[PDB]
Structure 1
Amino acid sequence: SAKDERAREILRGFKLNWMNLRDAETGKILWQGTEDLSVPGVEHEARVPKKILKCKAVSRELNFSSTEQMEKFRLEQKVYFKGQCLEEWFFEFGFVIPNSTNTWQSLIEAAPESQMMPASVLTGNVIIETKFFDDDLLVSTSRVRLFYV
């Protein structure tokens, strides 16, 4: 179908160039990288600081390029611990200009009544599953395993 082909076209033209995470309260950099974690079909790894688990909120800046136009570019993310989905996040970018490069700032908060497990338990056992959409159209599904260091 036209939609399966369009999805592959967007994937082909897409690149994550860089990304960082900051403590939202203080603005301090917690993590930054230039690995394209959007690449599907391989398990990526990232090492984040234990500290992050103590942040009430984390600000993420994500930089990407797209050759293809997108009407409603958005992400769905799932936080799995040992195969169990603990939390589900939804972020919207909206409209993407063909052959543009864009910086996308999002704010991450865990539910207020949730208490974080220690880093030592979590480390190596957290997978972040990210789905890239243009509206209803699934472009890419990627996985990153997290180590808390």
Structure 2
Amino acid sequence: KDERAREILRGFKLNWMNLRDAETGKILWQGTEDLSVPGVEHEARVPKKILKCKAVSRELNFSSTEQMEKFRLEQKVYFKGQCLEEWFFEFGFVIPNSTNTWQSLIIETKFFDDDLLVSTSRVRLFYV
């Protein structure tokens, strides 16, 4: 009844997230670890000229052991003030023991199955 829910939660893993320059198709920044682990919000290196890129493609890769029937995604961009970004996407079905990819074209990310929260990811900022 929630034993299942526990299985879902436990079988989900967000491998990596990245940022590309849409006009180029080049990876500016991509990370593969500490994406959803307890602690300091993993961050990384993305060369500041991203604001000089008029188009950016965010891509996520996640694996899931359990089959889900109504998987969705909520991505909100966060620096204090009134909010800069709201992104939603409904995947629907997810195959068991699957590895999937999602990318959008132009920071806490939440994954859901109907209304059970599967995972939360928070990453942050390098205009390095």
- TM class by shorter chain equals 0.7 to 0.9
Distance 1:137 1:40, change over 3 A: farther
Q: How many residues were matched structurally?
A: 128
Query: How many Å separate the matches in 2 of 1:88 and 1:60?
Result: 13
- Cα distance change of structure 1 residues 39 and 94 upon mapping to structure 2, 3 Å threshold: farther
Q: Are the counterparts in 1 of residues 16 and 35 from structure 2 also a CA contact under 8 Å?
A: no
Q: CA deviation at 1:143?
A: 1.8
- SS across alignment from 1:43: coil
Deviation (angstroms), 1:14: 1.1
Shift of 1:11: 2.1
Contact 1:59 1:105 in 2 (8 A): yes
Distance 1:40 1:95, change over 3 A: farther
SS of aligned partner of 1:84: coil
Q: Decide whether aligned partners of structure 1 residues 104 and 134 sit closer, same or farther in structure 2, where only a CA change above 3 A counts.
A: same
Q: Can you list the C-alpha shifts for 1:9-31, whole angstroms capped at 9, x where unaligned? A: 22211112233221112212211
CA distance in 2, matches of 1:138, 1:130: 11
**Separation in 2 of the partners of 1:138 and 1:40?**
16
Q: 1:61 to 1:81 in 2, by over 3 A?
A: closer
1:59-118: per-residue Cα shift (whole Å, max 9, x none)? 2332221001111222111112135432211123331111111222222xxxxxxxxxxx
How has the CA–CA distance of structure 1 residues 50 and 44 changed in structure 2, closer, same or farther, with 3 Å as cutoff?
Answer: same
Give the Cα separation in 2 of the matches to 1:67 and 1:74: 16
TM-score by length of 2: 0.81
Q: 1:98 to 1:40 in 2, by over 3 A?
A: farther
Closer/same/farther in 2, CA of residues 14 and 144 from structure 1, 3 Å limit: same
- The 3-state SS of whatever aligns with 1:147 is coil
Which 5+ residue runs of structure 2 have no aligned equivalent? none
SS at match of 2:37: coil
Report the Cα distance in structure 2 between the residues aligned to 1:137 and 1:100, rounded to whole angstroms. 19
Structure 1 residue 141 displacement after superposition: 2.2
Unpaired runs of at least 5, structure 1: 108-126
What is the alpha-carbon distance in structure 1 between the residues aligned to residue 51 and residue 91 of structure 2? 26
Structure 1 or 2: larger strand share?
1
